[PDB]
Write a protein that binds this DNA or RNA. Structure first.
Ligand SMILES: [K+]
Ligand SMILES: [K+]
Ligand SMILES: [Mg+2]
Ligand SMILES: [Mg+2]
Ligand SMILES: [Mg+2]
Ligand SMILES: [Mg+2]
Ligand SMILES: [Mg+2]
Ligand SMILES: [Mg+2]
Ligand SMILES: [Mg+2]
Ligand SMILES: [Mg+2]
Ligand SMILES: [Mg+2]
Ligand SMILES: [Mg+2]
Ligand SMILES: [Mg+2]
Ligand SMILES: [Mg+2]
Ligand SMILES: [Mg+2]
Ligand SMILES: [Mg+2]
Ligand SMILES: [Mg+2]
Ligand code: NA
Ligand code: NA
Ligand code: NA
Lengths: 144, 54, 53, 143, 107, 51, 122, 144
RNA sequence: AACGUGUCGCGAUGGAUGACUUGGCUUCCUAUUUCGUUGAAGAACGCAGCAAAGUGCGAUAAGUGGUAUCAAUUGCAGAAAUUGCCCAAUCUUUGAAC
RNA sequence: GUGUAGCCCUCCCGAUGUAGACGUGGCGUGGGGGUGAGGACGAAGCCGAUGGCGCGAGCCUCGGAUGGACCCGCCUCUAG
RNA sequence: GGGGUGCCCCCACCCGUCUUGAAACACGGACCAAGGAGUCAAACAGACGCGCAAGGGAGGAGUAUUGUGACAACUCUUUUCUCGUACUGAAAGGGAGGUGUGAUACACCCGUGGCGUGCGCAAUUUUUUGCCCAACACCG
RNA sequence: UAGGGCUGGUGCAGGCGUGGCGGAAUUCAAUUGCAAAGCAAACCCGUUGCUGAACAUUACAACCCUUCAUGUGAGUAUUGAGCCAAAGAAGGUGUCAGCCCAUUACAGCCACGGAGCCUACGCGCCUCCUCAAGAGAGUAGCACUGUUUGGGAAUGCAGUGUCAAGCCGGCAGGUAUUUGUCUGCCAAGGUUAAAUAUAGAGUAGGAAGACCGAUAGCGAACAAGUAGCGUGAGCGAAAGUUUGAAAAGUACUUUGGAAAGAGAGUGACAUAGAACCUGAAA
């Protein structure tokens, strides 16, 4: 709203906070990102060190649907189980079956302490995740 | 004085804004609720005419 | 609710909004610091300040 | 004093941190003593990584719905600040806690990313345009 | 110019709930400006038979019976010509807000 | 749970009772109402401009 | 239907009305005796009618209608006049909504209009 | 259940009973003694209240008990005092309901007694003057 | 002394202010909706009882014909139709102009 | 009970300032949503050796041997 | 007490501006009325208000309505898209809990990796100790 | 046997269109300065009680006092009684109007309707009609030059030169070359509704607005693209007729050549007297 701006407070100050010296002129120091290596060098080097230059190979016609691969950790698996099924899963009894694809996940990682044994269906899996889920009493079923 | 800001890439260097010398290049959606009513009315009319076809 | 998807009434921040009752309850008044005696009101005949004369 | 602070200065706490702190203190209790009450001037949020807690008594400004179910399901109790002022005036047998604020994204951007020994995160608009070779990177440590 | 606004869905439902709970407190109703000195109880609940009315005279008799006619009289007297340029732009008359009657449907 | 009486439309008489809904005991946040009302009332405006 | 929510539109249509529209606009109520005899609330005013003034300076006066000045939204009644400086008497206009009709001039067309305006059952 | 503490916070800044004229905050509350917009004086908001007024040449006391506070037509009860009632009697009646208004009640009751006496004297003097007058027209309201 | 200066009452000069608004600007919708050699768009000259501009019309020239409505037009004449809509017609010299 | 016509009563310490920053239940103008009034027994506007209030922006009363139909207080929204 | 007009004694360089420095022999300045200059959009950041929270939020569309109707209401195998819960390498690719015991190892799961300084609470006695939240330093 | 109203002919129905007509209830009762005004402090009492600081035989009208004459426009205002509402809607009428006027509806009624469109592809009759090969050649491709694209050892196109294949074909598969597989398609001829635009267009109509309010808003609220300017292409204003409810727009006497002045008269007001509301500052 226009009634909260500084211009309302400055009615009668004659300079609006820009000074008698210096004044408010149009485009000193240039327009846009001009002078990135002349007279604006210190700002660019201090705050954006990796701006000027190249790095790495190129990839023409990138299709991001081919590289889709979300990940979930072993310690967040109970967020996908039924609200009841957890807390009564044991070692050698019937266990819930979790499908990662239906929930929008591709790879299973192995961070943290597993809270309940289960059977997990996944596309990819890490070596540590496979070891931990087997020790707990569960299993991993590969799916495409 | 510029401080620690992101480097801007706002992409607004063509004559898109209508002024005293430019026609401009813009699109607005003030007809959105009216067109919503029109499409529903046409669907209801078509259903009445082709009855009882789905 | 059955008409709005997964909507429930928000929980209150205070279990009892009557704050004046709490301030004047017996449980609170037990642990309040005791009152102290205050001096007499100053009379006329302004007090002296010259400690020598 | 804490009730007057702004939202950014009243950080939320997780249920897992409360349970860990309670267990560390309660294990030293002498025979015939009750666990204290956890007090936080802020919000309490659920943690899916713990799933197993004892019966805790917590007083807070606000509880998330999933947090309230987990506490009550374990046998605990959610309290309000007006209830606390009645059961325990002067704050006897209470444990005062605060949330974490050093992990925020804003804190990661404090400083300059180009000075040696900084490890600050730059304000990057275009991620592709700010990529540096492994050499020419600034020095990582300074005394 | 940005004429319209977006509001979170949960915040919109929060406001409606709060404004409904305020209508059950007779002190807040009087403070807003309504005349409810003859109303039997708050909130006011009446029988379903008011939906079968067909003549305006029956509705007026029902309003006088439940004591809601004082508020509608207050709105009637407050009608007046608007001050300023607004009367030149199809806003010639102004009036106050009276009671609101809630029905299960639009019939 | 409190009860609410139902009054007849033709005479001063109670013709039934009903239980008070839970929506009437919810918190009253006049600051939320004011914020939502201010932004909602902007949605019916028509645009104006000069040539 | 001149009246609408657009005040600018409603006033433009009224003050630019054609002659046949103006005839309907200048109508007057009927007297109680005529109302009981025809079951018609009001009729447009025509020449050679007899009217009685109910509002203004000439309150209570009666006379015959001598002119229907549609260009000026008034009617001229005999014996309702004013004296000029030199002694000439000139008619004074009266708005048709300030008078009431006492006697009607009737022809075949007028009787047909009254019949079609009658509010009766069957 | 919403207490009067919350209700006062809602109406303190904006109410139909609050009159802010020339920087002065008074109140047009019908159940307010001395018309101060301070709470503890606003009887329309407190669960219990009592106000003192006059009806003809008698003191009229209106009281609001805590019971039936959701029925507007049964909230207030009227009481007419005996002629020439001592102000201490009125003070005791109010103190039985709102003990934190006892001294205010006594002053208000004394003011009402003075007002009733002055109203009688001024009306008698005006009637005397009108008897000697002569008037051009008198209006009589038709019966029924 | 006069000239000159100042205050109050009244009067000149001037056209601000307020209240008015058949105008402008902006957005939305609905059609049996899109000109011309069967001579268009534009341009010129004329036509009324009194008629300069403007409006309408074209030597059938502030209009002829049909239809609905139902007594006016109005500054003065003059008579004893007017208004809305539209099929049938008239349509001066030019202009793509052949 | 930050902020007032400050809830009230005592006591102590500072008070100038260009460029500049910030605060104010700080003043004023056109229009929207609410609430409460005023007007032919005279609205807006205009005039003044008309006084009163506020540190101030300003607000209010009085008179008109002026005017002839609309307009304002308070809470909020908005800006050519 | 206020207001108006004189008078006496005393005091008192012309405003705005650039400038180290203006009463300046530095520039703009005859008078009055009405106009007259930090606005709108889009990306990002920080402070402050509000809702929800390991999740948050849609858009476009659709479903039901002369009614304050270009408003308001509804749209859930767990949204159909987006930001976030995980980062790292030029890339192929890979991807993070604790304690105890041994030299994709084995066994357990009420749990701060350790040390230092650390609000408050708890325990002793006319002081000392315990748990330490947030935050900071050092070593794994 | 059956069809085709889009084979043709000849007839017969309804809708779309245009114009008009039709809806309730007070000009109720009390004045012409001063009671056509009030009080009885939430609601009720109240359909009831009580009156006058503008009248001491009338207040007010300019240095003070006395005397004599002059002065209040129009009831949509106030008060008390009613009435209508499937209608409370916002325009007009000498002040603020549901009941003075015009309007406000089909939960409708009439006239005209040549062609066209829509309806068991509306419905009868007569006529007619019906039920082994190949696949686009100065083309595609290639070279040089130019331009264009995010297209990068060359995305599309143009000029000239050169110029195919089809008994193991051709084009595409985003890093150049040769060779071999796999996948998807089959250029070099043509037609085609709907969902989309109207960023200084038109013809008829509607809905409006937190917009401007006569130095503003279009240049133009008015005989405005006009008057006026320039050889010309072109440029381009100012200006609310806003007196009054109604012209009732000042007869007549007198001075004056006239213009006008002094009286008189109309109007509630003429310091509302004619480009006439209000009428500021210098
Ligand atoms: K009338
Ligand atoms: K070729
Ligand atoms: Mg500078
Ligand atoms: Mg410099
Ligand atoms: Mg469109
Ligand atoms: Mg020729
Ligand atoms: Mg200072
Ligand atoms: Mg300064
Ligand atoms: Mg404006
Ligand atoms: Mg401006
Ligand atoms: Mg110098
Ligand atoms: Mg100077
Ligand atoms: Mg000098
Ligand atoms: Mg081919
Ligand atoms: Mg084509
Ligand atoms: Mg103009
Ligand atoms: Mg004038
Ligand atoms: Na200089
Ligand atoms: Na200069
Ligand atoms: Na102009």
């Amino acid at each position: 709203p226009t009634r909260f701006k500084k211009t309302r407070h400055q009615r009668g100050s004659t300079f609006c906070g820009y000074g008698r010296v210096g004044k408010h002129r149009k485009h000193p120091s240039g327009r846009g990102n001009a002078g990135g290596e002349h007279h604006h060098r210190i700002n660019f080097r201090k705050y954006h060190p990796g701006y000027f230059g190249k790095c790495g190979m190129n990839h023409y016609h990138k299709k991001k649907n081919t590289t889709w691969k979300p990940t979930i950790n072993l310690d967040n698996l109970t967020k996908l189980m039924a609200k009841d099924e957890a807390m009564k899963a044991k070692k050698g009894e019937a266990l819930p079956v979790i499908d990662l694809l239906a929930n929008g996940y591709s790879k299973l990682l192995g961070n943290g302490h597993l809270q309940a044994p289960c059977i997990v269906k996944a596309r990819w899996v890490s070596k540590l995740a496979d070891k931990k889920i087997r020790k707990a009493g569960g299993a991993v079923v590969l799916q495409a | 004085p510029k401080g620690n800001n992101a480097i801007p890439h706002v992409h607004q260097r063509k004559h898109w804004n209508p002024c005293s010398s430019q026609k401009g290049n813009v699109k607005v959606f003030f007809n959105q609720p009216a067109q919503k009513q029109r499409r529903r009315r046409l669907r209801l009319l078509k259903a009445k005419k082709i009855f009882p076809r789905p | 609710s059955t008409v709005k998807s997964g909507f429930m009434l928000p929980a209150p921040m205070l279990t009892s909004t009557d704050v004046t009752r709490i301030m004047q309850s017996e449980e609170v008044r037990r642990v309040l610091k005791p009152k102290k005696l205050q001096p007499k009101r100053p009379s006329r005949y302004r007090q002296p300040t010259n400690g020598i004369r | 004093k804490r009730l007057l602070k702004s939202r950014n200065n009243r950080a939320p706490i997780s249920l897992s941190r409360i349970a860990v702190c309670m267990r560390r203190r309660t294990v030293w209790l002498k025979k015939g003593k009750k666990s204290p009450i956890a007090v936080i001037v802020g919000d309490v949020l659920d943690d899916v990584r713990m799933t197993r807690i004892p019966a805790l008594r917590i007083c807070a400004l606000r509880f998330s719905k999933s947090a309230r179910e987990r506490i009550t399901g374990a046998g605990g109790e959610c309290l309000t600040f007006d209830q606390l002022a009645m059961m325990a005036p002067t704050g006897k047998n209470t444990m005062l806690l605060r949330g974490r604020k050093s992990g925020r994204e804003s804190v990661k951007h404090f400083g300059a990313a180009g000075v040696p020994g900084s490890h600050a995160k730059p304000h990057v608009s275009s991620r592709g345009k700010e990529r540096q070779r492994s050499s020419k990177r600034r020095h990582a440590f300074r005394h | 110019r940005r004429w319209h606004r977006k509001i979170n869905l949960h915040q919109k439902r929060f406001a409606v709930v709060s404004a409904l709970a305020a209508s059950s407190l007779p002190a807040l109703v009087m403070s807003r400006g309504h005349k409810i000195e003859n109303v039997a109880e708050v909130p006011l609940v009446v029988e379903d038979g008011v939906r079968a009315y067909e003549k305006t005279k029956e509705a007026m008799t029902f309003l006088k019976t439940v004591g809601a006619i004082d508020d509608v009289n207050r709105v009637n007297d407050s009608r007046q010509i608007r001050a300023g340029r607004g009367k030149m732009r199809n806003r010639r008359y102004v009036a106050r807000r009276g009671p609101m009657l809630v029905m299960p449907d639009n019939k | 749970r409190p009860s609410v009486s139902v009054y007849s439309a033709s005479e001063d008489k109670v013709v039934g009772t009903c239980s008070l809904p839970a929506v009437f005991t919810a918190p009253i946040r006049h600051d939320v109402v004011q914020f939502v009302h201010t932004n909602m009332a902007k949605n019916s405006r028509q645009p104006y401009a000069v040539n | 239907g001149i009246k609408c929510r657009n005040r600018r539109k409603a006033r433009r249509a009224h003050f630019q009305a054609p002659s046949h529209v103006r005839r309907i606009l200048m109508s007057a109520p009927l007297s109680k005796e005529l109302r009981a005899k025809y079951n018609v609330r009001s009729m447009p005013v025509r020449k050679d009618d007899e009217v009685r003034v109910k509002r203004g300076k000439f309150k209570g006066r009666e006379g015959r209608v001598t002119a229907c000045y549609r260009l000026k939204w008034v009617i001229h009644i005999d014996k309702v006049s004013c004296e000029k400086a030199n002694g000439t008497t000139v008619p004074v206009g009266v708005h048709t909504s300030n008078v009431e009709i006492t006697k009607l001039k009737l022809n075949t067309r007028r009787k047909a209009i009254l019949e079609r305006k009658d509010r009766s059952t069957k | 259940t919403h207490s009067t503490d919350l209700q006062w916070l809602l109406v303190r800044q904006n109410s139909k009973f609050l009159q802010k004229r020339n920087g002065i905050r008074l109140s047009s509350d019908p159940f307010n003694n001395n018309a101060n917009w301070t709470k503890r004086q606003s009887g329309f908001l407190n669960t219990k209240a009592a106000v003192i007024k006059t009806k003809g040449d008698r003191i009229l006391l209106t009281t609001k008990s805590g019971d039936t506070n959701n029925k507007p037509k049964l909230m207030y009860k009227k009481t007419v005092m005996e002629p020439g009632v001592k102000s201490s009697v009125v003070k005791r009646a109010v103190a039985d309901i709102r003990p934190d208004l006892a001294k205010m009640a006594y002053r208000r009751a004394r003011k009402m007694a003075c007002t009733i006496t002055r109203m009688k004297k001024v009306c008698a003097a005006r009637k005397e003057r009108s008897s000697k007058m002569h008037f051009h027209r008198k209006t009589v309201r038709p019966k029924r």
